Amino acid sequence: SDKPVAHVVANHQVEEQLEWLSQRANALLANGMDLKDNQLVVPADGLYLVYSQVLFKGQGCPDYVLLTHTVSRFAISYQEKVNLLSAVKSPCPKDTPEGAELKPWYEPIYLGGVFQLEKGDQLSAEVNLPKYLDFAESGQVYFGVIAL
Amino acid sequence: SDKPVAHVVANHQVEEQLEWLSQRANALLANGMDLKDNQLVVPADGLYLVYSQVLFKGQGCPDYVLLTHTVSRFAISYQEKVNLLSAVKSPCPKDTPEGAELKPWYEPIYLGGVFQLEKGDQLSAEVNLPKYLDFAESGQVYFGVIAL
Amino acid sequence: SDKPVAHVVANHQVEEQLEWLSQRANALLANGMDLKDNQLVVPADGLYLVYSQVLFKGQGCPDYVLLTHTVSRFAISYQEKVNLLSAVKSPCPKDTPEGAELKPWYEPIYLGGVFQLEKGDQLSAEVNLPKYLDFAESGQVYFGVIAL
C-alpha cells in the first residue's frame, strides 16, 4: 500500500487521440506516481513493472497501414527517448478489398516488462496512428506502472 | 509467500466452455484466494495484478466472427459488474472459401493490469464465444490474480 | 534479500535465430538469476512472474505457417520440458489470394503469468520458427523473470 502505482486509461471523449487519465473509477495514480504531459513519472530509483495495452479498430481497408505501439523511457540527460517495449501490427492488405458495407477489423497489442528506473524518469505509451484507437468500451486502452 | 495468489487454467476436458481449474501442474490458488462459481475472489482490500490469456482457433472462415475477452469486477459493495480489461479480435475479414480450403486460424489475446480491489470482490475472465477456445496444449488459456 | 530478476532481449545481430542477451541497456540479470544455454535459471524455490514477447514478420505468404511462442519449465527432477505459457498465430493462407501479395505482415505474441518454481529450474522462451522474428527495433522481443 506504499508502493508507487499507476494504471491510467484512455480519455474516451477525445476520438482519434491518446490522452491518459487517472480520474476513472478503476484507474490509479498513487504513492508518488505522477502523470505530467501525458507521461508517467517515477518517484524513486527502483524496479518497476511497466505495461500498456491499446486496441485498434478500422472499417474496410482503403489503406495498407502499419500500426505501432511503444512504451519509452526518457530522462533530461538523454539524446532522445529509448524503446523499452514495442510491437507492430498490419491489419490490412495493400489492395482495397471489394464491396460496400465494410465489416470492422480489430487489433489489440499488449506490452509489459520489468525495468530498473531512476527517480524522475518519464515513461510514455504511444501509438503512431491514434486515429484507429478504439476506446468505446472501458478496459481497452491502458498504461500502468507498479514499483516492485 | 503469504500474499494471496492465483493462476488458474482452463479445463481441457470440456470443449466450447471456459472453466477455470486450480488442480493442475503449474496452476496456483493460495494464501486466501478462492475460486467460486468460476470466479476468483480476493480475501482483502488491496492492490492486485490481474491478468488473463485466451487462445481462439477456427476452421476457416465460413462467416465473420467478433471475438472478445474480458476481465470484469463484481464489487461486493456496489453490486454491479464492471469491465477492468477487455480486447476484441476479428479473425475472419472475408468469407474467402466458396468451395476453397478451410485452413485453421489461431488468435491469442492477453490482458493485464493493476487494480485496487475490496475484500470479497469477485473477478471473472470470460469470452463471448467459448466455442472457439483452444485448450489442446497447456499454458494457452489462463487467469491470474496476485496480491501486491 | 534483493529480488532475483531478469529481463533479457533478443540479439538483433543474429537474424533468423533467438539468442537472449542481458548485457544491454534496459536489460537485467541480477540477484542470483542466471542465463545459461539461452535459458533463465532461478536460484531458489519461490513465486516468480515469468513473461515474454516475440514479434514475427513476413512478406508474401508463400507458405501457410503456424507460429508458436512458448515459455517452458525444465526441472532437474523432471528432465523434460513442460509448457507454462504458450500461444499460436496464423499470419497466412496456403498461398496469396490472387496472383501474389507483396505487403509485409507483422504479428506479436505476449505471454505472462506467476508460477511456483524450484531452485535450479530452467525457463526457456522459444518460437517454432525463429526465421520470422523481427528485431528491427528495440523492445520487440524479450523474456523476463522476477521473484515475487
Curated annotation (Swiss-Prot), chains A, B, C:
Superkingdom assignment: Eukaryota
Disulfide bonds: 61-92
Domain spans labelled THD: 4-147
Post-translational modification: The soluble form is demyristoylated by SIRT6, promoting its secretion.
Signal sequence residues: none
Localization per record: Secreted
Side Extracellular, residues: 1-147
Name under which the protein is recorded: Tumor necrosis factor, soluble form
Species lineage: Eukaryota, Metazoa, Chordata, Craniata, Vertebrata
Gene behind this protein: Tnf
